[PDB]
């Protein structure tokens, strides 16, 4: 919840070596190490409002990890263990940002 603390908000591309405890439709309890290749986006890097919107969430690392973990777990919940392992990366990556484009 609160382990690291730094004066700077890292905007450059990075990752989170997070592990989740998900459960598929076959109830198969498996933990799985995630990365969350992330980067902050600013279209106008001088506007005070947008720039201060960076520090909106004070625990953005945890927020990103929890949101992706929740959505991943919810989507793998609808598939069997066989499906979650055949299309492992496929279903987890569509789990994070489920749409059709």
């Amino acid at each position: 919840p609160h382990a690291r603390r730094a004066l700077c908000l890292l905007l450059g591309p990075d990752f989170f070596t997070d592990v989740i405890t998900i459960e598929t439709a076959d109830h198969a309890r498996l933990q799985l190490q995630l990365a969350y290749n992330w980067h902050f986006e600013l279209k106008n890097r001088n506007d005070p409002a947008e720039a201060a919107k960076l520090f909106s969430v004070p625990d953005f690392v945890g927020d990103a990890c929890k949101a992706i973990a929740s959505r991943v777990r919810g989507a793998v919940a609808s598939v069997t263990f066989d499906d979650f392992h055949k299309n492992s990366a496929r279903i987890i990556r569509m789990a994070v940002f489920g749409f059709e484009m």
């Binding site: 405890t21 076959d26 109830h27 198969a28 929890k66 949101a67 973990a69 929740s70 777990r73 069997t80 263990f81 066989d82």
Partner: peptide, 28 residues
């Protein structure tokens, strides 16, 4: 609204759905 994990606390939902696990994996 975001909900993280369904716990169910009782040990009888627990390793009894775990026998369900064993059957649902033996079928595979």
């Amino acid at each position: 609204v975001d909900v993280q994990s369904v716990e169910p606390v009782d040990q009888r939902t627990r390793d009894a759905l775990q026998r369900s696990v064993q059957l649902a994996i033996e079928i595979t």
